[PDB]
Every structure is written in structure tokens, then in C-alpha cells.
């Protein structure tokens, strides 16, 4: 399993708290920090659709 | 598949410079950025500044801020021939292409011709040991290596990052006597100025008057992007922060496949003592790989494409060759020398000379030293014998010589 | 006294010395139309007609022979093999012949006087001398001389030197 | 029972040979190797493949002066340009006419295609010959894969095999070892860390998924042009696509012995070098006793044909007596002739045709009927045809093509000189004798 972030609050990278299609904007800063780490595909794959 | 599509989705097109834009140089909605040729039948992928495939079969471009669309069967390109567009998936399109020093991608959407010409070489790279230019219409299959048509999830990645503040000199304008900055709809943008003191100033969706900076050039509008990415490209200022943002995994990787190689016309063989001779007609040009099958190869390689003819030597280790995409033929010789070997002297020297050329020459030599040697010295001792045998009898002063010694010394 | 005049008297005319820058070193033999000359004397024949010939060589039984014409074969020494033991004449008076060894008693013997033929009493030539080794009180001899067959022996003591 | 011999390393052709224990009939023992591989232990460096040159954003602030900031990219180049004025498509970037100050940066990265396009840099050493044995001890057949060190047996119903060591250590590999599209390459590669540019290891990376890449491209970023956004660059053109264009054939072209270079493990298969050793104990269960096999007296062989040819050019007929019907083995014990058949059945009486093939032009060799001894003699006669497909299946001898008229030109020639001067000798001395018998008498 694999913890992204968006904050100082953990969550598994295949349920994220915001999706492109309702916020666009903070999308972009969800998958900043998120590059160096071994769940990046896991995330964008859970953002990619709701 | 609006999973693997998505993606790029979230990106944006945009505008780039060109160098040869169909009149001089300028800023073209389809600057090529990359054309990666390693595919063997043909196979290139490029990748644009417009996107691909956002609708079935279409082409995204940035028009100065705004953006448009076109089908994507009136977009063209070639390198030295026309190519041909097969697919596209976001900033990569996926061609087919001869050989070429450069690639011209082209469009035309009023009568107002867009074009992009970069100086890349595109190579078409056969597969097997027959090169060829256009693929045949049949043969045998080997492993190659092309672009996967599909757009898959795979280990590459490129970096998608924040766009940089794009200027734009249409969005400054003038009143009675002022200057106006009038940004475009539900748009923020951000002012600077240098004709008073120094001003860094922001708008979101303002149509602000400035009252003073009477004239168009002491100001410079910017515009802001927040929403969307673009490439990581040379060809665009980056923004304040050091945030990459985030990365995209790129269609039409490299796979294992297979493809259709040519296969050589067959040689005509001709056999000799110790030799095999060939025959060798070409369609296209054609590598001839031989060796031997012994301590020393000896190897041979040679690109063939005219008709030859190829004497070669074989042993009895043996020889093998190797024919464009023909399996190896190895051949063996036995031992059939010019001669008789039971009889004529004359003969069996040829026989046992072809057999072993230097053996037959070192033997014959030698022995013909011993031979020659044992005769002179046996006519030796024999003179020595006879002065030996006649040297008391002709001394003596009546000088007569006995029967015996006479005849079989040839005393007289 | 008489034996060396009978010797000068037989020789005269048949001995011819061999002359090298005036100096005479050995003598030929002019014998059954043969002429026997040795191989160590060196030189010039002091005769005009025998020194425009060729000889034929023997080393090993140290004689040159040559063919000598017809016109002077009447006029050569004569030779036999019959010999008995006993005494014989020679250019410095007698020589003993005892158990086929020529010796000839000492004082006399030095470098030059090679080739000179052994006489009898008859006037024939038993033997040609050729060298001489000192054996205590009475000198040996290395010669040449002929059989009942017809072979030429050549006897040779041991560590002869060569005159 | 302890049998060992020694079998030719060379696959296709087959190889007979009889156990004899004294007083039990005699066992045909036939292997044929199928395949002889040669797998050296194999160790990865490093992999290399097309770089990628990733160009950096330029940085621009209009009167002002950027600072460079490492990175710690590999063969990472930074360098900043003052005085520029850049243009956008909407028209100038900058308001300055001087002052202003824009950074280039430019790094070197895989390429995106490396997972299915890249060469691996190796290293050889200690070979493990490998092979395929169909052995046939006794009319019962195995197939049987066996390793020719000097231990692991194999076992099956009771017969046990070993096969020796190989007499020789060679191999085709050397060194180093570059394997790249399926063909593997006898290449010099530099080190980890002495990657030059232009050449094969301006890129190198220590797994295909690693993370760490020494990169030594020759990168120089040069000033871009006046009047434009981009950053320009010139570096040396790629070490991997150069390797591709000036290969040498690969070792499957260019390999003695006639290896076979194969891929998925690295091996070389069917080598023809050396002799490969065996050795056998046999259970007591599997031999007969002589009276319960035909037994057999007064045989006799002439030869019908006899073709000094590669393959089976001979032909002999053994008329034999013997005293029951039934199969015993066949063998040449000599290297004269090598034997097609190994096993003849025989009946009470009658003949056995046995195809042999020889070297010699003028046979003699002593072949093993049953528990007997016969003497096969001909002529052979030479083939017609130049070249065959087919490789040699018999062994050479030296006077093995020497024509009885070529060893009487050779006696005839080189014995009577020693019979003349042997005669100068005696009738030198005969000469020398009877001169000196005619001198004793004076």
C-alpha cells in the first residue's frame, strides 16, 4: 500500500479527497509533492476519474 | 479508455518557436519538439506542441491564447515522400515515414497556411541481414522492434509543469488619453509598468484605467495560467516557484514484434577439389557471411548487390556460409585429388601433391639429397678402389697389367 | 775405392739432378722407359727433354712416372726381382740387404741425396732410395723395389724422416 | 563392472563401443550426444542505451540578475546569459534594452525507449560444459543430461555415467561480453565511471530499473539567439546509436569450432573441440553368460566395396559357422575402421553383410565378431564427389593414403642407396685387402 498526501494528513493514493473534474486547480498541487513517491501512478489513476 | 486519456486531459496545447514556418520564422502552433525514429518498418513518433485525440481523430492547437481544433486527416506531413499519420495520443503523434533529413508537418485552416520544418533526421532501419526501403510483399518473420500502436501505461515518464507567464501587447490598449489593460473573460492578469516610478500591479477581470504611462510600450500585460500544464520545453519562460507539479506517462513505446523480412534468391553452388564457387544474384543488396569451421575462422563479410561470383576454399574441417536471411549451409570436403594413386609415377607425385603440397615437396627433396649423395659416394670409392687397385701395377717399369685387374678395372 | 767409380760410371749419363735455385735436392730415375721422380724433392729437371712431360702422380706410394720416348729407352738402367740377401752397391759405397731392410752404416746421410737407385753386382736396379731413419749404429731405409707378381712395394720403418 | 572411453565432443555423429567381460557376451553400447552447451558464469556491470537531453525552462527576469543553483543532474550544465531580450508570440518578453539576465539549463536522462532497446555489459568466466547424451547401453534407450565435471553421476536401472572432464579450457567468450538484441558481442567496454563520449558507454546505468546513471555526453549550452526563447546546446552524438552503426558480425558469425552463439541463457552450443571422457559401472544383472548366446567358429571376411569416403564407403561380407541363431555385437577395436552396425543377428549359418567406413586407401584393420577375431583386407578406391554435407565419420591416421606403389618408389629408392654404399664399402675393402696381401711377401 502506498500514503499520498495533500497536507499533513495521510491517505491511500487510490481514494483522494479531490478529483480534477470537481477542482481543477488543487489537483496540480495534490500531485506536486507527490512525484517522489512510489504511489504517484496509483494517484493519478484515482484522479483521472471519479 | 478514458482512463490512459484523461491524463492528458489535465494539460493544455500551446505555441512555440519554428524555424522555417512557410515564410521565414515565427511562432507556430505545431513546433515539433522531438522526432523519435528507432522503430524498424518505418515507424516515427514525433511529439508536437498541439495535442491529439481531445474526439476520435483530431488535433488540438493553441491560436494565440485561444484554442482550436481541425480533423486530423488535413494534417499532413512528410519528410522526403508524404507520410502517413496513423494515430496520436496527447503531445506524441504517431507516423509511418521514408527517410528523410527533416520532417514538414503542415495544415491549412483558412487560406492561411501553417507549416513547421525541423532539420531531423528520420531513418528507416530494415531488419535481417537484406537492406531494403520499402518492405516486401512476403518472406519470413523475425523479431523487430517497432513503436506499439496502442497508448499503454509503461516505465516512461515526461514532466508536465506550470506554464509561465505569457505576455501579450494585444491585451494593452488606449483610451481618449490613457492606457488601458483589458484582460479577456473571467481572466486575471498581472501589469507592469516603468514610466513613473515602478509599478507591479494584478488584475482579476478589471478593465482598470491607468492614468498615467501615455504611451503603449511603457507597459507590458501578462497573462495567468493556473488551472493547466504544458511540456517542459525550452521554448517557454517557467514561473515563480520551484513546483514541477507533477509528471505523464507517453504513448507508443518501443515493443517486440514481428515483421516480414525478404528472402535472397538462392545461390547456384558449384563444387571443386578443395572449393565451392557461388553464384550470386541480388534482388537488393544483400550481406554474404562465411566462415570456417575450424581453429582459425577466418571470417568473411561483405555487402553484396550486384551480380558476383565467389570463389571460396573449403577444407576438410569444413565451411559454412551465410546467405541474406537463409539459414546456414555448411559443406565438407573429402579428399578427391587429380591422380592415380596405384601406378605411373608421374602420377601418384600429382596425387600425393595435390593431397599434401608441402609434405610431397620436402619428401621428394630429401630424398633425392640421399639418393644423389649415396651414388656420388659410391662412384667415389669406386675411383678410389680402381687408383688403388692400378696404382703398384703402373709404377713398375715393365708395365703389364694381370687378366682379373684388366677387364674389371678397365685397365688398357 | 772402385765401387763408387763403377757407380759414376753407370750413372753418368742416365742421373739427372733436380735443381731448385741452384741447389740440388734429388735425383730422377730413368728405368724401363719410366721416369721416377718423388713427391718432397721440389724443383726444375736439369734434362730439357724429361722436363716438358707429365707425370702421373702416386702419393701413396710417393712416385711421379712419366712416359719416357722411344728414342731413349735403349739407354736406361735395367731392373730385376730376383734378390738375394747380403751386399749391394750404392753411390757411397755398400748397403746390406738382410731380412728385406736396406741399412747403411752411419756417417753419411743428409738432405739431397734422394732417389738414388740401388745397384748389384751385375749392373740392375734393386731399389730407389727415398728416405732413412737412424737406428742406433746403422741407419734403415725407406724405399721402393718390386716382386715376382709385379706390385710395387714400398717399405717404410718407423718415424722415417725424409731426405 | 568399471568401463571408461573416450567419445569425440562432436553432436550428430554416434559413437559404438563393447564391454568385454571375459566370461559373459559381450554388451554394445551406443550414445549419440544430441546437444553440447558451454555456459560461462555471467555477471552485469552495467547497461547502456540512447540518451536524452532534457532541456530546463528558461528562467528570464527582465532588469534584474539570476543566480545558477545545482542540481546534481547527470553531466548537469548550467550556465546564465545577460543582455538578452526575448520575444513571445504577443509580442516582447521584457521592457529593459539591457539587464536582463536568462538562465539555460541541460542535463542527460534515459532515453523513454530503454526497457526494450538497450545493451548489457558483462563478464565471463568458468565455463560449465552441458549435454544432451541418448545412450543406448544394451538395446535399452535413454535420453539423459549429464554434466561433464568430475562428479554427478547419473543413475538409471542400475548403470551409472560420468562423464570426464573436457581436455580442453577453451571458449569463444572472452573477457567482457555485450549482449544487445538478441546477438551477443566480444566487445572491450570501458568501466563504470570511464564513459566517454562519442563511444559505447557515454551512458551507463547499473540495472535497466535503477535510479543512479553516470552520464559523460560532452554537453555545452551555447547563447541563444537575439531575439528568441530557447536553450541551444551541442554535445556529442550518442555512443550507443555509433556502437550500432560500426559493429563487427556478431559471435554466432564470427566464432571458431562452429559455435553456436545462443541468447536467453549465454551458451554456445555445438562446438566441436576436444574429447569428452566417460566412464561406466554396470550392474552384473544386465550381462549373459556366453552359452546362452550365440557362440561362433571358422569366419571369414572379404570386402566387397570399400570407398574411402566421409560417410559409409565400404562394405564387407563376413561368412562365418556358428552355433545358435540369435544377435551379438560387432566392433572394430583398431581406428581403422569405424562400423555402422554394432549389432548382427545371426542364424546357424550363412553371411553377414557389416558397413564400415575408413582413411585407408589399403585396409587392414582386425574386426570383433561375436567373441572371435577375423582380418578384413582390400583396396579402397577414391570417391567422386568434391564436397559433401555431412562431416567426417572416422578418424585419420598418418600412412593412412599411402599406395603400396608409393612404398615401392619409397623403398626401392631409399634402401637400395644404403645396398649400394653398403656394396661401396665391401668392395672397398675387399680392394684395400687384397693390395695389402699382395705388399707381405717384398
Request: hydrophobic fraction near 30%.
Given at each position: 500500500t502506498t500514503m499520498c498526501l495533500l497536507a499533513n494528513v495521510t491517505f491511500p493514493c487510490a481514494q483522494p479527497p479531490i478529483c480534477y473534474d470537481r477542482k481543477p486547480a488543487e489537483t496540480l498541487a495534490m500531485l506536486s509533492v507527490n512525484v517522489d513517491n512510489p504511489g504517484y501512478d496509483e494517484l493519478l489513476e484515482a484522479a483521472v476519474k471519479c | 479508455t478514458e482512463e490512459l486519456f484523461n491524463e492528458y486531459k489535465l494539460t493544455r496545447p500551446y505555441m512555440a518557436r519554428c524555424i522555417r514556418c512557410a515564410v521565414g520564422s515565427c511562432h507556430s502552433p505545431i513546433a515539433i519538439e522531438a522526432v523519435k525514429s528507432d522503430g524498424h518498418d518505418g515507424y516515427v513518433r514525433l511529439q508536437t506542441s498541439?495535442?491529439?485525440?481531445?474526439?476520435?481523430?483530431?488535433?488540438?492547437?493553441?491560436?494565440?491564447?485561444?484554442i482550436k481544433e481541425i480533423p486530423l486527416?488535413?494534417?499532413?506531413?512528410?519528410?522526403?515522400?508524404?507520410?502517413?499519420?496513423?494515430?496520436?495520443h496527447g503531445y506524441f503523434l504517431l507516423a509511418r515515414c521514408p527517410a528523410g533529413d527533416s520532417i514538414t508537418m503542415e495544415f491549412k485552416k483558412d487560406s492561411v497556411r501553417h507549416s513547421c520544418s525541423v532539420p531531423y533526421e528520420v531513418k528507416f532501419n530494415p531488419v535481417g541481414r537484406e537492406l531494403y526501403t520499402h518492405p516486401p510483399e512476403h518472406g519470413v518473420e523475425q523479431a523487430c522492434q517497432v513503436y506499439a500502436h496502442d497508448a499503454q501505461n509503461r516505465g516512461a515518464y515526461v514532466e508536465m509543469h506550470l506554464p509561465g507567464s505569457e505576455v501579450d501587447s494585444s491585451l494593452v490598449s488606449l483610451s481618449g488619453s490613457s492606457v488601458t489593460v483589458t484582460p479577456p473573460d473571467g481572466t486575471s492578469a498581472l501589469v507592469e509598468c516603468e514610466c513613473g516610478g515602478t509599478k507591479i500591479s494584478e488584475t482579476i477581470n478589471k478593465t482598470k484605467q491607468f492614468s498615467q504611462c501615455t504611451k503603449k510600450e511603457q507597459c507590458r500585460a501578462y497573462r495567468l495560467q493556473n488551472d493547466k500544464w504544458v511540456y517542459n520545453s525550452d521554448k517557454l519562460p517557467k514561473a515563480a516557484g520551484a513546483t514541477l507539479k507533477g509528471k505523464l506517462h507517453v504513448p507508443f513505446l518501443l515493443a517486440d514484434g514481428k515483421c516480414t523480412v525478404p528472402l535472397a534468391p538462392e545461390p547456384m553452388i558449384t563444387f571443386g577439389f578443395r572449393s565451392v564457387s557461388l553464384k550470386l544474384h541480388p534482388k537488393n543488396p544483400t550481406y554474404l557471411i562465411t566462415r570456417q569451421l575450424a581453429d582459425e575462422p577466418h571470417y568473411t563479410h561483405e555487402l553484396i548487390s550486384e551480380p558476383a561470383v565467389r570463389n571460396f576454399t573449403v577444407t576438410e574441417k569444413g565451411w559454412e556460409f551465410v546467405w541474406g536471411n537463409h539459414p546456414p549451409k555448411r559443406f565438407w570436403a573429402q579428399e578427391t585429388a587429380p591422380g592415380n594413386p596405384h601406378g605411373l609415377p608421374h602420377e601418384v607425385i600429382t596425387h600425393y601433391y595435390h593431397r599434401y603440397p608441402m609434405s610431397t615437396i620436402l619428401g621428394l627433396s630429401i630424398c633425392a639429397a640421399i639418393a644423389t649423395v649415396s651414388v656420388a659416394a659410391s662412384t667415389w670409392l669406386f675411383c678410389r678402389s680402381r687408383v688403388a687397385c692400378l696404382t703398384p701395377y703402373r709404377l713398375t717399369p715393365n708395365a703389364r697389367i694381370p687378366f682379373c685387374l684388366a677387364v674389371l678395372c678397365c685397365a688398357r | 775405392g772402385k765401387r763408387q767409380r763403377m757407380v759414376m760410371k753407370l750413372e753418368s749419363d742416365k742421373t739427372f739432378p733436380i735443381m731448385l735455385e741452384g741447389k740440388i735436392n734429388g735425383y730422377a730415375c730413368v728405368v724401363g722407359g719410366k721416369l721416377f721422380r718423388p713427391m718432397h724433392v721440389e724443383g726444375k729437371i736439369d734434362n730439357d727433354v724429361l722436363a716438358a712431360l707429365k707425370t702421373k702422380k702416386a702419393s701413396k706410394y710417393d712416385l711421379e712416372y712419366a712416359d719416357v720416348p722411344q728414342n731413349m729407352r735403349a739407354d736406361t738402367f735395367k731392373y730385376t726381382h730376383e734378390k738375394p740377401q747380403g751386399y749391394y752397391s750404392w753411390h757411397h759405397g755398400a748397403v746390406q740387404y738382410e731380412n728385406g731392410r736396406f741399412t747403411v752404416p752411419k756417417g753419411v746421410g743428409a738432405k739431397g741425396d734422394s732417389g738414388?737407385?740401388?745397384?748389384?753386382?751385375?749392373?740392375?736396379?734393386?731399389?730407389?732410395?727415398?728416405?732413412?731413419?737412424?737406428?742406433?749404429?746403422?741407419?734403415?731405409?725407406s724405399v721402393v723395389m718390386w716382386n715376382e707378381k709385379g706390385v710395387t712395394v714400398k717399405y717404410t720403418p718407423e718415424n722415417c724422416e725424409q731426405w | 563392472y568399471e568401463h571408461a572411453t573416450t567419445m569425440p565432443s562432436q553432436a550428430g555423429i554416434s559413437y559404438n563401443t563393447i564391454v568385454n567381460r571375459a566370461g559373459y557376451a559381450p554388451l554394445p553400447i551406443s550414445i549419440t550426444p544430441t546437444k553440447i552447451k558451454l555456459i560461462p558464469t555471467v555477471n552485469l556491470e552495467y547497461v547502456?542505451?540512447?540518451?536524452?537531453?532534457?532541456?530546463?525552462?528558461?528562467?528570464?527576469?527582465?532588469?534584474?540578475?539570476?543566480?545558477?543553483?545545482p542540481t546534481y543532474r547527470p553531466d548537469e550544465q548550467c550556465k546564465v546569459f545577460t543582455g538578452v531580450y526575448p520575444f513571445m508570440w504577443g509580442?516582447?518578453?521584457c521592457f529593459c534594452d539591457t539587464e536582463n539576465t536568462q538562465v539555460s539549463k541541460a542535463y542527460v536522462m534515459k532515453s523513454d525507449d530503454c526497457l526494450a532497446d538497450h545493451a548489457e555489459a558483462y563478464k565471463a568466466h568458468t565455463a560449465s560444459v552441458q549435454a544432451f547424451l541418448n545412450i543406448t547401453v544394451g538395446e535399452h534407450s535413454i535420453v539423459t543430461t549429464v554434466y561433464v565435471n568430475g562428479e554427478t553421476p547419473v543413475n538409471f536401472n542400475g548403470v551409472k555415467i560420468t562423464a570426464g572432464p573436457l581436455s580442453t579450457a577453451w571458449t569463444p567468450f572472452d573477457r567482457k561480453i555485450v549482449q544487445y538484441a538478441g546477438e551477443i558481442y566480444n566487445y572491450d567496454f570501458p568501466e563504470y565511471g570511464a564513459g566517454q563520449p562519442g563511444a559505447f558507454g557515454d551512458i551507463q546505468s547499473r540495472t535497466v530499473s535503477s535510479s543512479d546513471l553516470y552520464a559523460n555526453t560532452n554537453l555545452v549550452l551555447q547563447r541563444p539567439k537575439a531575439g528568441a526563447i530557447h536553450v541551444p546546446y551541442t554535445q556529442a552524438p550518442s555512443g550507443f546509436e555509433q556502437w550500432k552503426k560500426d559493429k563487427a558480425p556478431s559471435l554466432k558469425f564470427t566464432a571458431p569450432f562452429g559455435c553456436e552463439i545462443y541468447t536467453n541463457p549465454i551458451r554456445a552450443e555445438n562446438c566441436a573441440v576436444g574429447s569428452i571422457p566417460l566412464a561406466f559401472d554396470i550392474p552384473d544383472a544386465l550381462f549373459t553368460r556366453v552359452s546362452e548366446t550365440p557362440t561362433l567358429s571358422a569366419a571369414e571376411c572379404t570386402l566387397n566395396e570399400c570407398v574411402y569416403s566421409s560417410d559409409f564407403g565400404g562394405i564387407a561380407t563376413v561368412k562365418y559357422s556358428a552355433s545358435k541363431?540369435?544377435?551379438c555385437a560387432v566392433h572394430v577395436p583398431s581406428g581403422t575402421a569405424t562400423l555402422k552396425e554394432a549389432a548382427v543377428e545371426l542364424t546357424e549359418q550363412g553371411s553377414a553383410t557389416i558397413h564400415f567406413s575408413t582413411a585407408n586407401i589399403h585396409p587392414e584393420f582386425r574386426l570383433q565378431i561375436c567373441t572371435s577375431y577375423v582380418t578384413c583386407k582390400g583396396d579402397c578406391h577414391p570417391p567422386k564427389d568434391h564436397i559433401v554435407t555431412h562431416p567426417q565419420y572416422h578418424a585419420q591416421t598418418f600412412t593412412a593414403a599411402v599406395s603400396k606403389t608409393a612404398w615401392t618408389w619409397?623403398?626401392?629408392?631409399?634402401?637400395?642407396?644404403?645396398?649400394?654404399?653398403?656394396?661401396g664399402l665391401v668392395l672397398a675393402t675387399i680392394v684395400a685387402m687384397y693390395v695389402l696381401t699382395n705388399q707381405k711377401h717384398n
Open positions: - | 498541439s495535442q491529439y485525440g481531445l474526439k476520435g481523430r483530431t488535433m488540438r492547437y493553441d491560436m494565440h491564447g485561444t486527416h488535413q494534417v499532413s506531413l512528410y519528410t522526403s515522400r508524404p507520410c502517413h499519420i496513423v494515430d496520436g | 738414388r737407385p740401388i745397384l748389384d753386382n751385375q749392373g740392375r736396379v734393386v731399389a730407389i732410395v727415398l728416405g732413412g731413419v737412424n737406428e742406433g749404429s746403422r741407419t734403415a731405409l | 547502456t542505451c540512447h540518451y536524452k537531453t532534457g532541456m530546463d525552462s528558461p528562467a528570464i527576469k527582465c532588469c534584474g540578475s539570476q543566480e545558477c543553483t509580442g516582447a518578453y541363431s540369435g544377435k619409397l623403398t626401392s629408392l631409399l634402401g637400395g642407396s644404403a645396398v649400394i654404399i653398403i656394396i
